[PDB]
Amino acid sequence: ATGPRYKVPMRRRREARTDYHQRLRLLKSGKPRLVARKSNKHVRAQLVTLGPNGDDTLASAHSSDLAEYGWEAPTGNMPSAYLTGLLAGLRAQEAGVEEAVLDIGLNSPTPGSKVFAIQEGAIDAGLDIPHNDDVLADWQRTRGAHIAEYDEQLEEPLYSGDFDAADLPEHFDELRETLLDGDIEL
Amino acid sequence: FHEMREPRIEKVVVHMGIGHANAEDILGEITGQMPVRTKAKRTVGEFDIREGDPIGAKVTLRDEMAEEFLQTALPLAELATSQFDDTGNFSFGLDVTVNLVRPGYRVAKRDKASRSIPTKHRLNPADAVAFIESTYDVEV
Amino acid sequence: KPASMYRDIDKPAYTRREYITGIPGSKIAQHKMGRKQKDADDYPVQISLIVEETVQLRHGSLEASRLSANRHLIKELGEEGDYKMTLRKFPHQVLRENKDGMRAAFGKIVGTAARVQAGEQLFTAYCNVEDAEHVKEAFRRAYNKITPSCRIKVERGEEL
Amino acid sequence: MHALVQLRGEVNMHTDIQDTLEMLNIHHVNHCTLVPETDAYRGMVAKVNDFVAFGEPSQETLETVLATRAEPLEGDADVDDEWVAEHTDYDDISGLAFALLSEETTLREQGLSPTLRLHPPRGGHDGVKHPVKEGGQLGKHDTEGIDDLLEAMR
Amino acid sequence: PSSNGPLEGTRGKLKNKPRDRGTSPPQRAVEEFDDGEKVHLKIDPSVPNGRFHPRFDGQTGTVEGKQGDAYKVDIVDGGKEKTIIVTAAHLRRQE
RNA sequence: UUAGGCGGCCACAGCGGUGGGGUUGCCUCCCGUACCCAUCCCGAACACGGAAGAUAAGCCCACCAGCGUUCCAGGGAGUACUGGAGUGCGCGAGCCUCUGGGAAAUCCGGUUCGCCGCCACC
RNA sequence: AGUGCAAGAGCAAAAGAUGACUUGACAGUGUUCUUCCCAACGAGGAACGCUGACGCGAAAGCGUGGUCUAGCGAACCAAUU
RNA sequence: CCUGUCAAACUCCAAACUUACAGACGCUGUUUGACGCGGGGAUUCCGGUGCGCGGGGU
Ligand SMILES: [Cl-]
Ligand SMILES: [Cl-]
Ligand SMILES: [Mg+2]
Ligand SMILES: [Mg+2]
Ligand SMILES: [Mg+2]
Ligand SMILES: [Mg+2]
Ligand SMILES: [Mg+2]
Ligand SMILES: [Mg+2]
Ligand SMILES: [Mg+2]
Ligand SMILES: [Mg+2]
Ligand code: NA
Ligand code: NA
Ligand code: NA
Ligand code: NA
Ligand code: NA
Ligand SMILES: [Sr+2]
Ligand SMILES: [Sr+2]
Ligand SMILES: [Sr+2]
Ligand SMILES: [Sr+2]
Ligand SMILES: [Sr+2]
Ligand SMILES: [Sr+2]
Ligand SMILES: [Sr+2]
Ligand SMILES: [Sr+2]
Ligand SMILES: [Sr+2]
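Structure tokens for the assembled complex are given below, as produced in the milestone run.
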């Protein structure tokens, strides 16, 4: 900017999207990366392999396409996060992937958060990712019980668009069950 | 447009810089929340050698806690022209500072792909005065 | 001391004051002479003194020659005449002298010289056509007080 | 295709230069070689610039020289058309001299020594202290000037 | 020299050019190399570890295996052969 | 890529500016604290739940060259400096001829307001 | 800016600062280079591994001291396990 | 703004040139065995001059 001596950051550091310190420490494993990234209305999970010109994505899963198998609920919560992670892991197994490491980017490693919930799903899917069980949320909160009891304090329905009043953490079980299913067009 | 541009009280800091404290309590009362210590840096010849040590205590009032506090705090002070910062901020007086800003300030306060607010979307001293004056008081 | 001792450029550039100390003050009074307010472009005639051989000129020889050059101009054009002379060189080169035979031979600082490649302008005066003769004489005195042979080249003004 | 001719001795001559000369199959003053004009072969002669005399010869001249100063890989036998004919892929000296210039083959390939051991220039050379442009006999020559040397060194 | 440590006369080669300051890209610091491959030796002033003795910059060795994640690179100092322990961070493929 | 995620090179990408863009799609700003989690004080941030409103921010698109930068042309300049040679010149410091290389500042006109890979998606 | 001290060099979602937890300044055996360019030479030094045990972190991973290059010493004798 | 100068321990720049590896050409080795490896015997560790680049010193 100023002159010849000025030092301009790597593009992805200006944009503040990649923490290269945590990135290098991540690549050292030699294993692929289970990229867990959020969004306000969504949650995604990619599988990254190192490449000559840039990272290669061999498997992914967006919370949006989590509907193609029967999903009427929202797409930015705990149940959605676990499921999206489970989906990608299943597609991941398909390509040949058998192990990966958790990449959460700039998201905080907060106990029982959505990213660990995403991690849990891909592991449940058959993948081998170094984890720490107790840092994960409990099964009920993953299912969506924390939100079901929130809707208990009704007086005003939680969901705008029709789904149902008290909601259904069963829809979670119904979909999870559908993924473990041998058939299902991945 | 006017909607995603109409300013608001982001935070209201109220602190009492001492130099050696016990005064914390008065704020915890008038504000309605908990205060926090205030350290320091560099050795000072006015018996202030201990670098990290309790000198004052501030309180960051946001949302309602701030407004309800301003209903009384504002009248207690005569506002002036020169009392305004270029980014539409003012301090008066015990001290009271109001940090004002336009709707999407989370863009510069978040962790993921944060960005600095463009000079255009940056609040103006004049545009700030008008906003405040538009709420039970005068100006210069 | 004789200029034979320092007239040639045979040592490395020794100018880094952040390492050198006891450096003697410059005998040179001033580089800006004449009417240091009027521009060089405000004058029809511009004459410089060109050094024909690359050398090192000590501040005492720099001052001496410049003095006897400007003394003439002041004498012939009056103390406030319509001219302005210059000396574009500053003595950056530090000099020493080992003053015990060759043991611990590094000399102590004795003065400052000014390096000048051949064909360079040691001086450059600015005057009007009528005074263009006292300038050519001021330089004829100036070149006698320095080591190399010099040339008086006229930069502007073919008036003759 | 140029013709290298050592005119300056080995004594005091920088080692890396005499080695290049040796690589160019020349180990004695007045010895000569026929070198192609390639990126590589060029770098060498340029390094040999000050201790040699070179240029491109006229075919006529190259034929008179091959006639006189050329020899087999091993032997005292004189190379003449009749000799050329029986050993080379040619019919006479001219045919040979032609191929060398057009850079179609080499002296070795045709069972001939790479060195044309010449005789001291008749009437002396123009000097070994200055280049050709300065009135000396070193460096690069003219297709006429090179012939003048070579022929004097029959 | 006035001292004979490893960093003697290493101001130039071991310094970063202004615009190259700060942390370096991980892509090369994790690069994979094969045995028999030719690699250029040059330290990355930004990377503190996995360095070889400064004196060996500009070399072009042949990878012959690894030690941990770091590499064992053969080179020929003058006439003497040496095996150098270095990380990919200071290595570049020939050609 | 009518706004996405991961990158490579790491300013050709910087600095600054102009203009354009989003009904059930996206990213956002946005809305809100029962929970996971959270602040030496603030649901600000982090974390969680959610769509009433908006495209002003950001972001994506198109464009500007004033600064910085990359490269190109002519100018400077085959100048400065230089590897090889010389019974070439100079009292000398030094210079010159041939040979093979060859800048820098700066001026002038251009170029640059990133290019590329993987996956995803009307 | 700071980073214990010469100088030179390295570092900004850190190598700097604050906070907490921790004591890896751990046990054991090596590879390579350095000391000693090339080119033989000891003590010392460093980078890079392996095995055991540990600290931390969600995990990758980081920790064989203080960001790197100075702070070091033979046999004999003595004391200690 | 304009104007005048510098740097062995300065550098936005930057050669010639030296240098690692590789290929090509050259030269060289496969009865003259190169390259390399092992062993025996040394001498030697007062150097000097020219040229280029030097550092100190009139
Ligand atoms: Cl994210
Ligand atoms: Cl090494
Ligand atoms: Mg023979
Ligand atoms: Mg005769
Ligand atoms: Mg003669
Ligand atoms: Mg140097
Ligand atoms: Mg707009
Ligand atoms: Mg002479
Ligand atoms: Mg004893
Ligand atoms: Mg003891
Ligand atoms: Na405290
Ligand atoms: Na870097
Ligand atoms: Na906008
Ligand atoms: Na040792
Ligand atoms: Na000796
Ligand atoms: Sr000298
Ligand atoms: Sr004596
Ligand atoms: Sr004179
Ligand atoms: Sr809020
Ligand atoms: Sr003489
Ligand atoms: Sr003399
Ligand atoms: Sr050219
Ligand atoms: Sr270290
Ligand atoms: Sr050298």
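DSSP finds two helices and six strands in chain C. The two ends of chain C are 43 Å apart (CA to CA). Further analysis is deferred to the final report.
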